[PDB]
Amino acid sequence: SMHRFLTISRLEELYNTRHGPTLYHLVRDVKPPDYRISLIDIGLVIEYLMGGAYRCNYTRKRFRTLYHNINHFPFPFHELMVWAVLMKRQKMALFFWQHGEEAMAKALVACKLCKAMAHEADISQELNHNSRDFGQLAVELLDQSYKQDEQLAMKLLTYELKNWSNATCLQLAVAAKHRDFIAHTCSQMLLTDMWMGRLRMRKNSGLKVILGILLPPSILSLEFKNGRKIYEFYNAPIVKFWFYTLAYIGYLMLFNYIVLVKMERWPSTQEWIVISYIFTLGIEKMREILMSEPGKLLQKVKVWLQEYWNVTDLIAILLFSVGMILRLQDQPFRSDGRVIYCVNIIYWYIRLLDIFGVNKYLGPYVMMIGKMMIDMMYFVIIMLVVLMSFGVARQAILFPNEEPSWKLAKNIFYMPYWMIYGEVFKTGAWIVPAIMACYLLVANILLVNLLIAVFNNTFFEVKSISNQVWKFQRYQLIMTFHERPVLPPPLIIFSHMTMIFQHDDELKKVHDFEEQCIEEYFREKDDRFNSSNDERIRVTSERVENMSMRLEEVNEREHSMK
Amino acid sequence: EILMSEPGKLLQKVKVWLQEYWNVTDLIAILLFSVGMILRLQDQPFRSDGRVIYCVNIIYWYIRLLDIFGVNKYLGPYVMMIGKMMIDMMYFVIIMLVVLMSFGVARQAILFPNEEPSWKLAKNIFYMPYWMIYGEVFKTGAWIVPAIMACYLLVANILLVNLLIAVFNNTFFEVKSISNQVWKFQRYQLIMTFHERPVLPPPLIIFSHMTMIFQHDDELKKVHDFEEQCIEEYFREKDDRFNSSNDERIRVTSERVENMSMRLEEVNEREHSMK
Ligand SMILES: CC(=O)[C@H]1CC[C@H]2[C@@H]3CC=C4C[C@@H](OS(=O)(=O)O)CC[C@]4(C)[C@H]3CC[C@]12C
Ligand SMILES: CC(=O)[C@H]1CC[C@H]2[C@@H]3CC=C4C[C@@H](OS(=O)(=O)O)CC[C@]4(C)[C@H]3CC[C@]12C
Ligand SMILES: Cc1cc(NC(=O)[C@H](c2ccccc2)N2CCCc3ccccc32)no1
């Protein structure tokens, strides 16, 4: 009995043993040669590898305190599989996964662990195979469960796991970035149901949401079927998304009207509205960070800072506040400070790109731009190397008598078309500049055509995958907007006030269903493999050889009998 | 044509007849042309205002030839590609605006520090001139910042142009991969459309309507037998082809070998006992 066999001392000895086929180095980095490894350190390194905002049942201070002070793991298979994947023992991990509770959750964790170990660190080989194999197994298990029962598969996809720090399968898949799992039909159906919220409407959803936002009192009553109806309509994430979009458009229009016209000693009403917008957004950001409690206050910001867009937003807010402060510093400083928050507008116009990835037909363009930014960066070096040489040569040939005056960069970088063409059309002094002009003119068009071809190839390569990639971001967007309150950014100031004012048989059935699903998967795999033509041909050949040999031997007996 | 579209009675005949978009557009164009003609004969003040309407109306008639240019083998792919790329251009417009308008507004705000709205800023922001911006490219910071803005705008313009080129190339390739197959379908519609129509041209069918008003089982059994024979032959051929498949034959041979080997092994014991 593994349950009876399992014990703290035995597991510690197993972990600390070196009699077998990167655990030591990784533990040392996370944490002393031949140091006695305990469950606490193993859990700590596990949490390190999983990522931020994660937890492990064994990897906790209370568990460490208990260990320091039955002693049987209720689910030994989980720890055994975690160890097996930790020490890079694949067949044993497969066997353990063959018999275990909540196999899908463990499989996704293994895929996450394999990828994380590969990135931290044969390393390439295991990354390509081990992590991919675990992900494929999870996908196959999901597919079988959906075939057996759609409702039960949907229920299994989302439910709190006490063992794994209460993280659903979807969250683990997203953390592992396994696009295949999310792309499955059941996952997309669940995401669409979540996005539509309580309302079941599925035809002309955008127009219906726009009408509901425009005409609450009349639209909401009818839209509820497709009081409490208005409240549940508001709480849906889609209407929140449209509300935020409209508020952002209004903010953009006010910002355009403010900076573009005039300035006075005291700001106008529109500038006050914009300042209120930014103040409320800052309050919302601070609240969101505050609710990001896991890891305590000190270790909450570190995880929250992973996203780049959030950091850019903070930087933009700081620059806007600095510009506003400088504005109210008399005319000499007002004129100097206006430009800063005039330039600040650029960030807000570009922030819509991160929101333009939601649409099916719009995200490919953003992905292509992101891909081609680096290509343009590299192309710039070649462009400079080619053009600057000829420009410098042409400039040197002309203006034989000259003084630096820090004014040659403009002359070399001018690169005019009409002027060069005219310059194209004693004798040698005229011939050489013509040759230089012709070479520059040819090089310009050569580079232009090269850039065109580069962009075409990059766009084709991006488009070959953008459709598959698009589906992943939907879960992030939906889980992001769903958590956010219902009021727009300028009106959530009251929302915070309301927030402050406010302050087992099914499990057994699911376990049985999972066991049945895995048994059926193994049976189907074995039957399909045994029914393969290649295997059957081999079996027939071996049987024929033995049958022929027996017949030949029997022939001698028949002759002797006669 | 609507009158002869009798099925569904008078009330339910228009509903079906209205499915085609081109017919509705034709009706709209006819109504606008008639309105413009009526306005034309309303003295000079209304004649000058009504002429423009039926001047603009010409655009529809020039574009109606596209629905007739799909017949040709080599001409329909272009129309299909245009129809496909219309939506792509619609989506591209949003990105173009989002990118360009920000820089344009920033540049406009940096310049003209003292200004009044006068409902005349859209032209300034949307001007987007090439030569003027290039000249503007080439105390110190006030000169540096506009140069940076101009350079960014100049780079963005060509980036967007190349992006549009790539998008159009990809869309054209995808359309051309299927246009040849698609073209054949429209021929039946065109043929059954023109066949029903009378012989005179549109301006002369006025007499055609006058002429119209003036005017006002063994084979079945053989066909049934042929169909029955065809379906029987199809089933027979399907069964024969499936049974002749290598995969099926290998399985059959393997099963027979196993049974034959088992019988031989059992017979061996009988032979030994007999001896
Ligand atoms: C590729 C080029 O052609 C560039 C690259 C480096 C540039 C140089 C940088 C340093 C200075 C010092 C300055 O003296 S000063 O009194 O005006 O400050 C005069 C201008 C001068 C000589 C630049 C001339 C142009 C460059 C050679
Ligand atoms: C992105 C932009 O820059 C555009 C978008 C919305 C436009 C504004 C719409 C409303 C009006 C009212 C008008 O007052 S009036 O007496 O002339 O009628 C002056 C012009 C003004 C301020 C426009 C300025 C330009 C915009 C800010
Ligand atoms: C389109 C579109 C824009 C957008 N902008 C926001 O939603 C919101 C915001 C509000 C006012 C000004 C600037 C941005 N902002 C950015 C992204 C999501 C988010 C999350 C928490 C707190 C703020 C915030 N949403 O759709």
Side-chain angles (χ1 to χ4, degrees), chain A residues 3 5 7-9 11 14-17 20-21 23-24 26 32-33 38 42-43 45-53 60 72-78 80-81 83-85 87 89-90 92-97 99-100 103-105 107-116 118 120-121 123-124 126-127 129 131-147 149-159 161 163-176 178-198 205-206 212 216-218 221 227-228 231-263 265-295 301 303-305 308-328 331-371 373-400 402-414 416-425 428-430 433-467 469-493 495-496 498-501 503 510-511 515-516 518 521-522 525-526 529-533 535-544 546 548 558 560, chain B residues 1-8 14 16-18 21-41 44-84 86-113 115-127 129-138 141-143 146-180 182-206 208-209 211-214 216 223-224 228-229 231 234-235 238-239 242-246 248-257 259 261 271 273:
Chain A
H3 48 268
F5 177 92
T7 313
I8 307 179
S9 60
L11 186 56
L14 204 184
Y15 269 100
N16 192 260
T17 198
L23 179 280
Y24 169 79
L26 178 56
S38 180
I42 273 52
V45 59
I46 288 161
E47 177 55 29
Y48 172 25
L49 201 79
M50 293 312 307
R60 278 163 177 169
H72 298 343
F73 297 92
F75 292 87
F77 275 99
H78 298 178
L80 267 288
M81 174 158 41
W83 149 77
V85 176
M87 297 190 175
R89 309 199 191 189
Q90 197 143 346
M92 181 171 296
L94 266 292
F95 167 56
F96 271 94
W97 180 89
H99 265 283
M104 183 177 293
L108 297 177
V109 171
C111 182
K112 172 58 179 179
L113 293 161
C114 294
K115 264 174 65 178
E120 188 66 10
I123 300 301
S124 181
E126 62 86 6
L127 181 275
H129 185 65
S131 183
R132 213 305 306 274
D133 190 2
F134 281 108
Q136 178 57 23
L137 268 44
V139 173
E140 298 179 352
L141 176 55
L142 169 59
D143 191 7
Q144 183 60 24
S145 60
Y146 181 78
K147 294 174 179 179
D149 188 331
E150 61 186 1
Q151 197 70 1
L152 256 293
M154 302 255 182
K155 185 174 185 178
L156 176 67
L157 277 172
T158 59
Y159 78 98
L161 321 181
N163 309 324
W164 307 92
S165 180
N166 302 94
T168 57
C169 305
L170 295 173
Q171 302 179 11
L172 299 168
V174 171
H178 197 75
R179 288 166 167 78
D180 304 1
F181 196 106
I182 309 300
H184 195 247
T185 294
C186 177
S187 54
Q188 294 296 75
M189 268 299 306
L190 176 54
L191 292 177
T192 294
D193 183 9
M194 183 66 169
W195 171 254
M196 288 307 317
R198 189 60 166 80
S205 181
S218 178
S221 59
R228 186 66 59 185
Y231 181 90
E232 58 82 13
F233 176 90
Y234 270 15
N235 200 274
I238 188 176
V239 299
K240 280 192 294 180
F241 171 90
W242 284 119
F243 240 52
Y244 281 51
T245 296
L246 273 40
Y248 197 89
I249 278 178
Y251 160 96
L252 268 174
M253 296 300 172
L254 296 184
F255 213 75
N256 297 129
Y257 165 79
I258 290 154
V259 70
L260 194 72
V261 57
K262 200 174 184 62
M263 209 59 62
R265 159 57 193 173
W266 290 115
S268 57
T269 58
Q270 288 73 341
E271 194 163 11
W272 281 123
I273 283 172
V274 162
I275 285 174
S276 180
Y277 256 91
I278 272 51
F279 174 77
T280 55
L281 183 146
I283 276 177
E284 185 66 12
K285 239 64 179 178
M286 93 82 179
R287 170 270 191 93
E288 192 178 13
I289 285 168
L290 180 278
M291 294 300 295
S292 181
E293 274 184 350
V301 167
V303 178
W304 177 92
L305 206 83
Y308 290 96
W309 279 112
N310 229 325
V311 177
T312 58
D313 163 73
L314 182 61
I315 283 173
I317 294 166
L318 288 182
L319 295 201
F320 179 94
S321 59
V322 167
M324 182 277 171
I325 289 175
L326 294 190
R327 204 188 75 84
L328 315 189
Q331 179 70 199
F333 296 83
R334 162 155 60 248
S335 183
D336 302 331
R338 166 174 175 273
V339 50
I340 281 174
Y341 90 83
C342 162
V343 165
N344 175 273
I345 193 179
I346 290 169
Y347 169 84
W348 307 116
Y349 261 88
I350 279 178
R351 180 133 186 73
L352 294 182
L353 300 191
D354 190 10
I355 311 311
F356 279 180
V358 61
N359 186 306
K360 175 179 173 182
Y361 297 78
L362 218 68
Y365 289 55
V366 175
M367 275 294 176
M368 193 289 309
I369 274 174
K371 163 58 179 176
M373 181 58 64
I374 304 302
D375 181 304
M376 175 173 289
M377 176 181 293
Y378 281 144
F379 172 95
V380 163
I381 291 173
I382 287 169
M383 172 166 57
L384 266 65
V385 168
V386 168
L387 292 179
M388 183 156 127
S389 71
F390 291 151
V392 166
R394 190 200 69 175
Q395 197 67 224
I397 294 301
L398 311 187
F399 307 78
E402 183 67 311
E403 302 176 2
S405 299
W406 236 126
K407 201 164 186 176
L408 299 307
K410 177 175 69 175
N411 304 325
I412 58 178
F413 276 105
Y414 206 104
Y417 166 90
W418 50 269
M419 182 190 302
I420 291 176
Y421 195 83
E423 179 180 357
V424 180
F425 49 68
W430 153 90
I435 299 171
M436 285 302 312
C438 180
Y439 276 137
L440 275 171
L441 191 61
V442 168
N444 287 28
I445 78 185
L446 173 153
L447 295 184
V448 162
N449 300 28
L450 170 52
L451 171 64
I452 289 170
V454 164
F455 254 106
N456 187 140
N457 188 323
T458 55
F459 177 93
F460 177 88
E461 293 183 3
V462 168
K463 172 57 63 57
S464 62
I465 305 166
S466 57
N467 175 30
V469 172
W470 153 76
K471 294 174 181 175
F472 186 16
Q473 319 305 348
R474 279 183 54 178
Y475 163 86
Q476 179 184 345
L477 174 61
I478 297 159
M479 188 61 179
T480 308
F481 276 59
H482 162 269
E483 193 282 340
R484 224 145 301 288
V486 58
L487 289 183
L491 299 171
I492 45 60
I493 184 175
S495 291
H496 301 294
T498 61
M499 184 188 70
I500 294 177
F501 164 82
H503 294 273
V510 169
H511 280 238
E515 294 293 352
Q516 175 273 357
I518 183 171
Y521 166 86
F522 282 161
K525 172 182 173 182
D526 295 0
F529 177 85
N530 298 26
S531 178
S532 61
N533 299 24
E535 187 67 5
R536 285 175 167 175
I537 294 169
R538 182 192 67 85
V539 172
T540 305
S541 180
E542 214 289 342
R543 287 159 170 269
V544 163
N546 301 26
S548 57
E558 165 55 17
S560 57
Chain B
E1 192 178 14
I2 285 168
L3 180 278
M4 294 300 295
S5 181
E6 274 184 350
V14 167
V16 178
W17 177 92
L18 206 83
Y21 290 96
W22 279 112
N23 230 325
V24 177
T25 58
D26 163 73
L27 182 61
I28 283 173
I30 294 166
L31 288 182
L32 295 201
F33 180 94
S34 59
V35 167
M37 182 277 171
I38 289 175
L39 294 190
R40 205 188 75 84
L41 315 189
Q44 179 70 199
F46 296 83
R47 162 155 60 248
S48 183
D49 302 331
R51 166 174 175 273
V52 50
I53 281 174
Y54 90 83
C55 162
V56 165
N57 175 273
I58 193 179
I59 290 169
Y60 169 84
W61 307 116
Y62 261 88
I63 278 178
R64 180 133 186 73
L65 294 182
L66 300 191
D67 190 10
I68 311 311
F69 279 180
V71 61
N72 186 306
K73 175 179 173 182
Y74 297 78
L75 218 69
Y78 289 55
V79 175
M80 275 294 176
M81 193 289 309
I82 274 174
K84 162 58 179 176
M86 181 58 64
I87 304 302
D88 181 303
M89 175 173 289
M90 176 182 293
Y91 281 144
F92 172 95
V93 163
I94 291 173
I95 287 169
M96 172 166 57
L97 266 65
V98 168
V99 168
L100 292 179
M101 183 156 127
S102 71
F103 292 151
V105 166
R107 190 200 68 175
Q108 197 67 224
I110 294 301
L111 311 187
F112 307 78
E115 183 67 312
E116 302 176 2
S118 299
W119 236 126
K120 201 164 186 176
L121 299 307
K123 177 176 69 175
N124 304 325
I125 58 177
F126 276 105
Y127 206 104
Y130 166 89
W131 50 269
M132 182 190 302
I133 291 176
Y134 195 83
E136 179 180 357
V137 180
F138 48 68
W143 153 90
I148 299 171
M149 285 302 312
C151 180
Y152 276 137
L153 275 171
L154 191 61
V155 168
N157 287 28
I158 78 185
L159 173 153
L160 295 184
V161 162
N162 300 29
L163 170 52
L164 171 64
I165 289 170
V167 164
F168 254 106
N169 187 140
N170 188 323
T171 54
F172 177 93
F173 177 88
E174 293 183 3
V175 168
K176 172 57 63 57
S177 62
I178 305 166
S179 57
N180 175 30
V182 172
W183 153 76
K184 294 174 181 174
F185 186 16
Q186 319 305 348
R187 279 183 54 178
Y188 163 86
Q189 179 184 345
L190 174 61
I191 297 159
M192 188 61 179
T193 308
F194 276 59
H195 162 269
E196 193 282 340
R197 224 145 301 288
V199 58
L200 289 183
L204 299 171
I205 45 60
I206 184 175
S208 291
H209 301 294
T211 61
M212 184 188 70
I213 294 177
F214 164 82
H216 294 273
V223 169
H224 280 238
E228 294 293 352
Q229 175 273 357
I231 183 171
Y234 166 86
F235 282 161
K238 172 182 173 182
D239 295 0
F242 177 85
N243 297 26
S244 178
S245 61
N246 300 24
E248 187 67 5
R249 285 175 167 175
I250 294 169
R251 182 192 67 85
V252 172
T253 305
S254 180
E255 215 289 342
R256 287 159 170 269
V257 163
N259 300 26
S261 57
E271 165 55 17
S273 57

